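Morning!

As promised:
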Amino acid sequence: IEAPDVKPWLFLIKPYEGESLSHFLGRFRRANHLSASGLGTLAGIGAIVARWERFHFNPRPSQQELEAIASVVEVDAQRLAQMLPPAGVGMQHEPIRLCGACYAESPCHRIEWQYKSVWKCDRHQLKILAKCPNCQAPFKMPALWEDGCCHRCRMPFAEMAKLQK
Amino acid sequence: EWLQAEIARLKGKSIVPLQQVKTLHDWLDGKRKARKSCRVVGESRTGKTVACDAYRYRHKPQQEAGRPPTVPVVYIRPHQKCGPKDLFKKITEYLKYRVTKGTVSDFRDRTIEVLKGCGVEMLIIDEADRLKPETFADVRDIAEDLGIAVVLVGTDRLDAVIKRDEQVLERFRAHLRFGKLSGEDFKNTVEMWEQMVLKLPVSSNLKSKEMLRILTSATEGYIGRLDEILREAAIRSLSRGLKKIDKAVLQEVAKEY
Amino acid sequence: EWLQAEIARLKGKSIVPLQQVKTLHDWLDGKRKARKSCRVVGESRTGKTVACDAYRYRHKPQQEAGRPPTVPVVYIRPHQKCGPKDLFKKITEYLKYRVTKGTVSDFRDRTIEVLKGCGVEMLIIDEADRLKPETFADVRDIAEDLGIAVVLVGTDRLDAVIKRDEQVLERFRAHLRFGKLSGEDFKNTVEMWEQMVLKLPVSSNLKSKEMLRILTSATEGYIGRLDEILREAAIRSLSRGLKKIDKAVLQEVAKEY
Amino acid sequence: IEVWDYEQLREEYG
DNA sequence: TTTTTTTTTTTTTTTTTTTTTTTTTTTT
DNA sequence: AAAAAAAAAAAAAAAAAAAAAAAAAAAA
Ligand SMILES: Nc1ncnc2c1ncn2[C@@H]1O[C@H](COP(=O)(O)OP(=O)(O)OP(=O)(O)O)[C@@H](O)[C@H]1O
Ligand SMILES: Nc1ncnc2c1ncn2[C@@H]1O[C@H](COP(=O)(O)OP(=O)(O)OP(=O)(O)O)[C@@H](O)[C@H]1O
Ligand SMILES: [Mg+2]
Ligand SMILES: [Mg+2]
């Protein structure tokens, strides 16, 4: 029989302050090698989670998919709740904005950048990117980011911060 | 009822230290630190599987509240005609990791992620010859990619399978063999079994020449047969209200084998 | 603890510029500039994988401030029964870009884009006989489409696979073979290994006639065995507090092989 | 002659 | 009276491959 | 007040083949 005094488990990650949901779930899927359907399956909440990765949130199933999923990612309902805009505010969609100046501190994405009113970073004092400055492509969901490398134009991403502001 | 308590005991299982077992434990340890793969061979009733259990238990897995465990030794047993998917699945389950549907390459990527991080030093594969010939590609891959010693355990047929492929023969060339009981060793065993396993109030005094003749012919040196036979003899004997094992009841049991 | 520090070292790996290795590196270079495909053959313990790896590392990927890395040499190893999708996926990962989800034609189109632009001159495929017979269509395709030399590395079986298809045999007709150690070459190796790998305080002095007999019988010319054997002998020897490898401990190890 | 550690090459990798 | 040695079908498997049915999520 | 175009998970279906297995046959 299998080994004694253990329980079922998976690999856990820690959120960063301000971290967005789509981003967080992506890290999780990568750390544990699985599909969104897979997450939804371990979870028992259906296929619904895949559009979360591209920011579509009709609901806040706070006591349903969201109270439930804490048990898989080991993060509580409230910390998780904080990974989405408060009811009624924010709600930007198509361009994905980024301040690479913060990447020197931590690769991440900060969800505040996707509230409709934003165009500047106050913490680093500057114009937020809404498009890549070199190849002039829009960016892919935070959810699908790899190693802090640009496919369109490889650089350190962080290396880009001297320019544009 | 006193008698029922005793019958339930005899019906069960236990581990008795023996020389064969000690030898293996020290040999494997050498191999574990040296990180070298090897195989263990011997006849099917020598008690190879049990020595391997006794070993596993001497190294308690450790666990903290949050991060993943440290599991120095992993022991698995394959199913007949084991494929590449079946091997990864069993490795992943033995560590109580949650996983479901995916393709072979996906179980492979996952197997290397759970084997890493989690301290694993040795993998032991029982019934080793149930592996399909292609799976050895995955067994070698792990052994060479990760600092993990792989031990193959089996009967003489295992070597007949291995010699069919030079790539495998060479990684697993070193070996240890289990043997049978004989002479003074069979006699001392019998005596240990009486004091350490049977324990009847009446004292049997088995080592007697006329009794070892019965057992020797009946068991032919296999520890497997020796155990079954003396246990069937104490249980039958007690059910009949006797306080010891005599010559005739032992012969009555041995005759059925 | 001084002893622990040393055991950990001995348990590790290193690359020694042997005579066999020097030749391959020059041969491949010829092939690289000439842009021609070829194959390398030899027995499984001759150290083919290591000679080929050592080569890869002598040509570090280069990087400018703007464009993608230039990567002259790509080294990959397939899984067993490798399919057409599996080959592209590994080439794409090797070059640090990952595309996920699509069909076979999509992996192919993407493989040609990363192989282009990024300078690639040579592709090395280890254990080439893990390839499924149809995948060679994709290996030839790349070799003919892009000015990339493809090298197939493997055992005698590789040629049994290749000779079953004229289309492949002809692109990959040229070959180099690895051999075994012998005569003066086996002796010179032994001596190098003592000074370059073991490094005990007290010279064990193995090239001595009496000791080489033990090693020759034990190793039969495979560099693989020679390395395992001398390392297992220094580790066992130190664990017992000895300052050198002697005759009896070497025989104690060799007996197990 | 130069001899290399096996993991070193990885530590110095491009 | 056994020992290779050759040919051959029946099956079993694991991709993969294209495809419809459905359910959705938002915008004036 | 309400409808429309779609990205994706899911679903039989074929689908070709690698390998183990089942006979057939020739001599000393
Ligand atoms: N150290 C031991 N203590 C007690 N019983 C033992 C010991 N070793 C072997 N046995 C006996 O052998 C049996 C276990 O099977 P055993 O190891 O003899 O065969 P095995 O090698 O597992 O068979 P196979 O290799 O074919 O799976 C038990 O019933 C037990 O009575
Ligand atoms: N230059 C070298 N220095 C030290 N050891 C070497 C060298 N070349 C080969 N080896 C030995 O060979 C082993 C590495 O595998 P090897 O070089 O045999 O690859 P390979 O021959 O391609 O194996 P296979 O063909 O079975 O896949 C190491 O354990 C090492 O001891
Ligand atoms: Mg067993
Ligand atoms: Mg190799």
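Residues 83, 103-104 of chain B lie near DNA strand E (CB under 10 Å from a C1').

Hope this helps with the figure draft.
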